[PDB]
Amino acid sequence: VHLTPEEKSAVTALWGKVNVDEVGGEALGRLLVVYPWTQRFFESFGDLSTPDAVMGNPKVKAHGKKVLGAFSDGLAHLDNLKGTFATLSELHCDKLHVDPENFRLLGNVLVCVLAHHFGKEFTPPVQAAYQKVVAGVANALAHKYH
Amino acid sequence: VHLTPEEKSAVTALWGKVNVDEVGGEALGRLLVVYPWTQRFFESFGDLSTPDAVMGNPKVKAHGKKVLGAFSDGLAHLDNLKGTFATLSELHCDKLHVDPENFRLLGNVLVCVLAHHFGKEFTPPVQAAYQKVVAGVANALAHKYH
Amino acid sequence: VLSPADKTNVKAAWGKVGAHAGEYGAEALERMFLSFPTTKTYFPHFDLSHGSAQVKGHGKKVADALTNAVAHVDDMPNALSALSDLHAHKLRVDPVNFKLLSHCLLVTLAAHLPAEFTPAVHASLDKFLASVSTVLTSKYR
Amino acid sequence: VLSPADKTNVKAAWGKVGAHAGEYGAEALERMFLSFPTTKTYFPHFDLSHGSAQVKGHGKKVADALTNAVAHVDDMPNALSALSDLHAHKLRVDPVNFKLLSHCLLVTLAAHLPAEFTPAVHASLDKFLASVSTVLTSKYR
Ligand code: HEM
Ligand code: HEM
Ligand code: HNI
Ligand code: HNI
């Protein structure tokens, strides 16, 4: 993927209505609740023992902000996602030791969060465009693993 | 996928020793035995009732040879697998209606068949090169799906 | 395994879906076909574009199967036995596709149930759909 | 579900493996790290140098657990209970990686058991490794 011009416009239009800080915290939080083995990377974040403990965890929210911030910046470069995320790919491999499968899990949780926030506005074609985006971003973040 | 010059040599060298008739028949046969739901695409091949029937089936053997022949041709296009399998990708999508996940399953089985034949000669580094190849071929065959 | 809280959450959420089950089933299928084009390989005999009568009808069948699974949440292997037979011996959908439909069902529920689709309920529904999927692929080989 | 025929094939094949199990476990790990480098993200604390004693030691542990699972093939959930606890609560390896290790174990067996690795035995071993993987991820959430 390979987004169509109509899909790029749809992605950009919806994202203009997104509070990136807020959606970021929500997405990372839900990742850790729905797939709790992903908590393995965040022992230093403190209390993750209940859904509320995770979702309201200040360090989770803070991290979610920086993660979706990087995601947001990448939306300006949909034709070169691999290059855009190359240094973050290398970092997540060499320094953070994060299985790239986690990027796929986060992408699908993000899509759920967008649907939750936007409701009927998150139409099936709009979802399809965002699925291309989160797949591209996950693939790009996985690309420099070795 | 991006093979190293050293891996390209290892792939080509091992393949020069491959009996495509045997390996092709064995690979398609084992696909149908190990993952029997894949038999859904080959009802016209006749008797697939037992493992012996599958492996000994003339149409299974003939098809396996043909499939591996196309695979072999792809080995001469390692820097452009997408281009060389573009036609077959469209075919499998639009005419054959084959879920591309099956390409990965076949790749798995092929690697097992190569290991079975070559034994200790199928070293971990040689396997790693061939995993790059089968992933590349599967991705190339899936690339034109729509 | 589904926890007591999971089962409470699934029953509550699906109960709220209520009469919309069939509509939401069809919407999840459409979302799947658009988002994951490889899933269309299982429906070459279908009209898959928006407003499809075949998709609407199939959505109802899928939804009704899920409703039955919820009603028998402690005995899904047996409640779904005939359906798992059909999947194993006829439909023979590759297991990866169940995750794709499950995701699209979650997206559909999130889009329609703002108050109900909490993180905990989200987690429970994902487990539930994974468990249903496991039952439906349990007889493949 | 593992059929009685599956269990016969697995017991026979693993019996042939015998005291080579530890060696084959290490080889399967080596094959996995090379073929599927993302799996190395679970071992940053390991020495992954060629012929690593730490990797060989881990191969032995993996093999011993599999040998125990073969010996208790009728009741693997109970036999692997402590190990499944550790995986769910501490190791927390993403489920996709179990298929990668399973494949590399099959490749290793195929390379060492030219006579025993028939299509039927291949199928049974694949089902067995998938079943072990299911038990090891059964308490994840
Ligand atoms: C859209 C996907 C993602 C993006 C764009 C992203 C981006 C980032 C960025 C910008 C940083 C800070 C880098 C630095 O410290 O120099 C970071 C750190 C980190 N990321 Fe990712 N990330 C993503 C997904 C994930 C996922 C899914 C996980 C694990 C489940 C993860 C685990 C981590 C960890 C553990 C850190 C270090 C946190 C710390 O400082 O304690 N990331 N990420
Ligand atoms: C490396 C992977 C593969 C390659 C290179 C390949 C290649 C080919 C080729 C060259 C043909 C004949 C094209 C023609 O007749 O014009 C073919 C046909 C076909 N392929 Fe594939 N194939 C691959 C994998 C698969 C898999 C995994 C499946 C299903 C599980 C599959 C299903 C079929 C079917 C059903 C046909 C038509 C057979 C018939 O005529 O009845 N292929 N393939
Ligand atoms: C991507 C493919 C795919 C997936 C993921 C999937 C997942 C599911 C799930 C998952 C939770 C459920 C509950 C479910 C339920 C059903 N499916 Ni699915 N099915 C799929 C492809 C089919 C196909 C194809 C048919 C046949 C439809 C037809 O009309 O020919 C089908 C038929 C059915 C029927 C009708 C049975 C009958 O006619 O007796 C039910 C019920 N199903 N399917
Ligand atoms: C790719 C990652 C991965 C996979 C797929 C995997 C799959 C498996 C399988 C599948 C059939 C088996 C039988 C198995 C068995 C074991 N693993 Ni695994 N493990 C994995 C990564 C680990 C890690 C990491 C450890 C901790 C090692 C250490 O010593 O720090 C581990 C620890 C163990 C131990 C040691 C337990 C103890 O110390 O009490 C056993 C036994 N395992 N692992």
Side-chain angles (χ1 to χ4, degrees):
Chain A
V1 296
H2 119 314
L3 276 296
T4 70
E6 297 79 7
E7 282 178 323
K8 291 185 177 180
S9 297
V11 166
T12 300
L14 193 74
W15 199 256
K17 305 179 180 183
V18 167
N19 188 314
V20 171
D21 288 345
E22 199 69 25
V23 173
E26 176 81 7
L28 184 57
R30 281 187 185 246
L31 176 75
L32 271 55
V33 170
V34 174
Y35 312 103
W37 53 94
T38 63
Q39 292 170 23
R40 73 193 306 279
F41 301 105
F42 304 104
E43 37 272 308
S44 66
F45 281 21
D47 187 12
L48 301 171
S49 62
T50 69
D52 293 337
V54 172
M55 298 303 300
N57 186 297
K59 290 181 175 181
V60 168
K61 282 188 171 182
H63 195 60
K65 290 193 223 295
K66 80 163 64 173
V67 164
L68 207 64
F71 180 90
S72 185
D73 297 338
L75 296 185
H77 309 280
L78 291 177
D79 294 326
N80 187 21
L81 289 177
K82 285 172 176 161
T84 295
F85 288 103
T87 49
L88 278 173
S89 181
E90 293 171 330
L91 184 82
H92 281 76
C93 180
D94 296 345
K95 300 298 183 180
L96 304 178
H97 312 295
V98 175
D99 183 352
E101 175 63 20
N102 290 291
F103 305 135
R104 300 175 180 89
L105 293 180
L106 179 63
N108 286 335
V109 174
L110 175 58
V111 170
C112 286
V113 169
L114 293 175
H116 193 218
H117 180 74
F118 286 103
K120 57 184 177 182
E121 185 166 357
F122 200 70
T123 69
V126 171
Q127 174 186 355
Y130 268 89
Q131 296 286 170
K132 290 187 179 177
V133 171
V134 297
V137 173
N139 164 256
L141 280 164
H143 192 247
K144 304 302 182 295
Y145 276 64
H146 62 98
Chain B
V1 293
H2 293 355
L3 288 166
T4 68
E6 300 78 28
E7 284 178 319
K8 285 179 175 177
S9 302
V11 167
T12 301
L14 190 73
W15 197 254
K17 299 182 178 184
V18 167
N19 184 317
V20 172
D21 299 34
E22 287 182 329
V23 172
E26 275 286 310
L28 184 58
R30 281 176 189 260
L31 179 78
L32 301 180
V33 172
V34 177
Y35 312 106
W37 56 91
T38 60
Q39 293 178 20
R40 68 192 302 269
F41 301 102
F42 303 102
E43 193 180 24
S44 65
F45 282 18
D47 187 15
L48 302 172
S49 59
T50 72
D52 291 334
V54 172
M55 309 304 292
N57 188 305
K59 289 186 174 182
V60 165
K61 299 180 70 176
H63 194 56
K65 178 175 181 176
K66 177 184 292 183
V67 165
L68 208 62
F71 182 88
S72 301
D73 295 340
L75 299 185
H77 282 108
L78 288 173
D79 289 330
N80 192 11
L81 295 173
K82 293 179 179 179
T84 190
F85 285 108
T87 301
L88 278 176
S89 184
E90 168 68 18
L91 181 76
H92 283 76
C93 172
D94 181 69
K95 301 298 184 175
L96 301 176
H97 305 110
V98 175
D99 186 348
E101 191 61 32
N102 292 295
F103 302 141
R104 165 175 149 64
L105 291 182
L106 183 60
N108 287 346
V109 173
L110 177 61
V111 171
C112 288
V113 169
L114 290 176
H116 193 208
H117 172 71
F118 285 106
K120 291 179 177 52
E121 189 175 355
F122 199 65
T123 65
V126 168
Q127 177 187 351
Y130 268 88
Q131 298 285 174
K132 288 188 184 180
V133 174
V134 297
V137 170
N139 182 67
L141 280 166
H143 191 248
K144 303 300 180 301
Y145 273 64
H146 60 270
Chain C
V1 185
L2 299 176
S3 75
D6 288 326
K7 290 179 285 178
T8 297
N9 288 340
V10 170
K11 286 182 180 295
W14 203 246
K16 274 296 183 176
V17 168
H20 295 277
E23 284 181 356
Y24 292 177
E27 177 179 337
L29 287 168
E30 177 173 39
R31 290 179 178 280
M32 184 187 66
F33 294 137
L34 291 179
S35 287
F36 309 107
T38 59
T39 62
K40 295 192 300 184
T41 62
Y42 294 99
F43 300 86
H45 57 299
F46 269 40
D47 169 32
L48 296 177
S49 293
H50 188 77
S52 171
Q54 282 167 301
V55 173
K56 288 182 180 181
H58 182 62
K60 180 58 176 170
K61 297 182 184 180
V62 174
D64 288 348
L66 292 175
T67 296
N68 186 51
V70 171
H72 297 276
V73 70
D74 297 294
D75 192 39
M76 290 192 287
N78 289 305
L80 284 163
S81 190
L83 186 56
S84 61
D85 286 343
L86 185 69
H87 277 264
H89 304 143
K90 182 174 177 296
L91 305 181
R92 290 171 288 188
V93 176
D94 187 276
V96 64
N97 297 285
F98 290 84
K99 298 179 182 301
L100 303 177
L101 178 58
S102 294
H103 171 67
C104 288
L105 285 158
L106 291 180
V107 169
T108 300
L109 297 180
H112 287 279
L113 307 169
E116 289 73 17
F117 199 76
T118 65
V121 167
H122 179 172
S124 297
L125 287 167
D126 192 58
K127 286 181 63 181
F128 171 71
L129 292 173
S131 185
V132 169
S133 298
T134 293
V135 171
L136 294 185
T137 61
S138 62
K139 300 169 180 174
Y140 272 28
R141 62 174 182 175
Chain D
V1 131
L2 294 182
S3 72
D6 286 325
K7 300 178 180 179
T8 300
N9 290 331
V10 171
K11 287 182 175 303
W14 209 253
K16 174 59 186 299
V17 174
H20 289 286
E23 172 192 338
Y24 293 176
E27 176 177 338
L29 288 171
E30 178 186 12
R31 292 180 177 279
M32 184 187 66
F33 294 144
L34 288 182
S35 292
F36 306 108
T38 61
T39 61
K40 290 187 296 189
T41 63
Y42 293 101
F43 299 87
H45 59 302
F46 267 36
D47 164 31
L48 296 180
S49 66
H50 186 86
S52 164
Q54 193 165 24
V55 168
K56 293 183 185 303
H58 186 63
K60 189 59 157 51
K61 293 176 184 176
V62 173
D64 286 350
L66 291 178
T67 296
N68 184 241
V70 169
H72 300 86
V73 73
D74 290 328
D75 191 14
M76 297 203 307
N78 183 76
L80 302 170
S81 181
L83 187 54
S84 186
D85 287 342
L86 183 67
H87 276 263
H89 302 318
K90 185 177 185 181
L91 306 184
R92 289 171 287 184
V93 175
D94 191 279
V96 301
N97 297 281
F98 288 83
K99 301 172 185 301
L100 305 179
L101 178 58
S102 293
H103 170 70
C104 288
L105 283 158
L106 286 183
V107 167
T108 300
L109 293 175
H112 287 276
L113 305 179
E116 292 79 9
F117 203 73
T118 65
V121 169
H122 182 171
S124 295
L125 286 170
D126 198 45
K127 287 182 65 183
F128 167 72
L129 294 174
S131 185
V132 172
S133 297
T134 295
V135 175
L136 291 187
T137 60
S138 61
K139 303 171 180 177
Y140 266 40
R141 59 174 180 170

